[PDB]
């Protein structure tokens, strides 16, 4: 028995404690790189909270057993020159992840798919405690975001998935692929950066219109 609740920035420490236990260790990219201590990922994870559209799953004892951290994303201004997130990162391993994200954004702009949309919901970090996996918590976290979307006239939910494993969960929830890139094809300086196990395949950007 669990609740799905809005995350408050005062929940930050508890959210980070949970992420350090699971996501930091078991996201396919993190575990491949052996991420270790990563204050930059902590910073990254806390950033979307004040947008007031991130959700926690909480068990009967009051412990966080899942999160979906979401932020609002706005269409680039006409005069915008994009910034690389990787430029402001000192952590070498996390910088590789940010560089991959920058590369995806350089190759694919979600706002090109949806020319009429000014604001899109961006699902940034999804993580469920191992002992509570396979119970539909990911879906219930996602469903709470649909409520926020309805309340605010947002039509598109965008989620970058770092493995085919997680893309499949989003597919079950009614998302569809809008962009993909195999890890084997990601060669920013001529050589492969990421080679997790074969079933992960690569990144998939998933979208749903609600
Ligand atoms: C991805 C993740 C959030 C899924 O959350 P979830 O609440 O377990 O989602 P679901 O209940 O829909 O289960 C998804 C699938 O996991 C599998 N599964 C079933 N039991 C499981 C268990 N005990 N442990 C792990 N996976 C299980 C099933 O294939 C299941 O699909 P199905 O129920 O439709 O048959 C979770 O695995 C996770 O935290 N992964 C590591 C962090 C990560 O990569 N986050 C990015 C996600 S985009
Ligand atoms: C929806 C979701 O959880 N995407 C994860 C992307 C990601 C972010 C930071 C480090 C590794 C991987």
CATH number, residue 144? 3.40.630.30
Whether 97 lines ligand 2, by a CB cut-off of 6 Å, is yes
Q: Token digits for 103?
A: 């590369």
User: 3-state DSSP call for residue 158?
Assistant: strand
Q: What is the resolution of this structure in A?
A: 1.3
Distances (CA, A) of 81 to 77, 106, 134: 9, 11, 42
Range(s) of the domain holding residue 185: 1-210
* Segments of the chain assigned E as strands: 2-6, 55-59, 64-74, 119-128, 156-161, 176-182, 202-209
Cα 50 to Cα 29: distance, rounded to the nearest angstrom: 26
Q: Is 173 annotated as a binding residue?
A: no
The method of structure determination was X-ray
For residue 66, give the ligand nearest its CA: 1
Backbone angles phi, psi at 108, to 5 degrees: -150, 125
Query: Which tokens in the block code for residue 195?
Result: 């080679």
| Phi, psi for 197 (deg, rounded to 5) | -55, 150
- DSSP output for 27-88: SHHHHHHT--S-HHHHHHHHTTGGGS--EEEEETTS-EEEEEEEEEEEPPPTT--PPPGGGG
Residue 127: closest CA among 23, 11, 200: 23
Sign of dihedral through CA atoms 166, 128, 85, 187?
negative
DSSP 185: G
With a 6 A CB cut-off, is 29 part of the ligand 1 pocket? no
Q: Ligand 1 pocket check: which of 97, 133, 199 to mutate, most ligand atoms within 8 Å of Cβ?
A: 133
- CA separation for the pair 8, 31 (Å, rounded): 28
Query: What separation in angstroms does the CA of 158 have from each of 40, 145, 190, 196?
Result: 23, 11, 29, 24
Asked if residue 53 lies in contact with residue 145, where contact means CB atoms within 8 angstroms, the answer is yes
Q: How many domains does the chain have?
A: 1
Residues 121 and 72 sit within 8 Å (Cβ to Cβ): yes
For the chain, what's the residue count? Answer: 210
With beta carbons less than 8 A apart as the criterion, state whether 71 and 154 touch. Answer: no
Ligand 1, atom 39, residue with closest C-alpha: 127
8 Å CB contact between 29 and 194: yes
Residues 7 and 56 sit within 8 Å (Cβ to Cβ): yes
Which two tokens mark 75?
């269409």
User: In angstroms, rounded to a whole number, what is the distance separating the alpha carbons of residues 148 and 153?
Assistant: 9
């Amino acid at each position: 028995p669990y609740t799905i609740e809005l995350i408050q920035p005062e929940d930050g420490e508890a959210v980070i404690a949970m992420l350090k236990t699971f996501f930091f260790k078991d996201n396919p990219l993190n575990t491949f790189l052996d991420l270790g201590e990563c204050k930059e990922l902590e910073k990254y994870s806390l950033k979307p909270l004040p947008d007031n559209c991130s959700y926690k799953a909480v068990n009967k004892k009051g412990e966080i057993i899942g999160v979906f951290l979401n932020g609002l994303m706005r269409r680039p201004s006409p005069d915008d020159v994009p910034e690389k997130a990787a430029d402001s990162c000192e952590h070498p391993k996390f910088k590789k992840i940010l560089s991959l994200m920058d590369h995806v954004e350089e190759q694919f702009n979600i706002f090109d798919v949806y020319p009429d949309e000014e604001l899109i919901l961006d699902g940034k970090i999804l993580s469920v405690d191992t002992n509570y996996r396979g119970l539909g918590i990911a879906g219930r976290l996602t469903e709470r975001a649909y409520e926020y979307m309805r309340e605010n006239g947002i039509n598109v939910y965008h989620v970058l998935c770092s493995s085919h494993y997680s893309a499949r969960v989003m597919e079950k929830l009614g998302f569809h692929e809008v962009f993909r890139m195999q890890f084997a094809d990601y060669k920013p300086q001529g050589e492969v950066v990421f080679k997790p196990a074969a079933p992960h395949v690569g990144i998939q950007v998933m979208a749903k219109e609600v």
